């Protein structure tokens, strides 16, 4: 179990607890979180709703991005060079104590 | 005198610097030389959105009453949220001191 910060829309941080192994949606999700629309087509690469934005340290670490994630995530909402979709990032020792924010919005 | 102000870069990055009281958010900026492309454009004469700003709740909250001279050109500006003001109609006062603003996000 390791712990991460979620920076809501609204401001707040959000500080939990998930499985080394998971992705961030089954963090949200799993950990029932605030975050609204959060991982919509569940995981199936088929929205941006889960869309996350990292630190550049943790960021530069990450899987290698398929074009499958990429082309999906270029068309995202609040788009940055430090973004990646939640649903295709697992938990790994090294994102311990790691912040993540969730896109801007009105 | 001075007080401290913390700015979170584009690329994330967190940049602090102090301002003298009385002092817009955007001559903060100007003044000390921050790293912020393209921020200030009007140079403080409401004529663009450049110099929006994200502010925490609990001070966005205790700001000047927002003129509709600012919103009718905050609404132009990308990235918006439910604390965002034009930098350059903020003026630092001592309540500000050690907050933490942000620059609208942008590829
Ligand atoms: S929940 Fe849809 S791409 Fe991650
Ligand atoms: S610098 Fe243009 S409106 Fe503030």
């Avoid at 979620?6 to 992705?23: A, H, P, Q």
């Avoid at 530069?60 to 999906?72: G, R, S, V, Y």
């Avoid at 979709?85 to 896109?103: F, H, S, W, Y």
């Amino acid at each position: 179990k390791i712990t991460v910060h979620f920076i809501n829309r609204d401001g707040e941080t959000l500080t939990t607890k998930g499985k080394i192994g998971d992705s961030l949606l089954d963090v949200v999700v799993q950990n029932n979180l605030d975050i609204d629309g959060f991982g919509a087509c569940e995981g199936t690469l088929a929205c941006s709703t889960c869309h996350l934005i990292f630190e550049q340290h943790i960021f530069e670490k990450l899987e290698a991005i398929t074009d499958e994630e990429n082309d999906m995530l270029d068309l995202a909402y609040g788009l940055t060079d430090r973004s990646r979709l939640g649903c295709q990032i697992c938990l790994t020792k090294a994102m311990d104590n790691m912040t993540v924010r969730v896109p801007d919005a009105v």
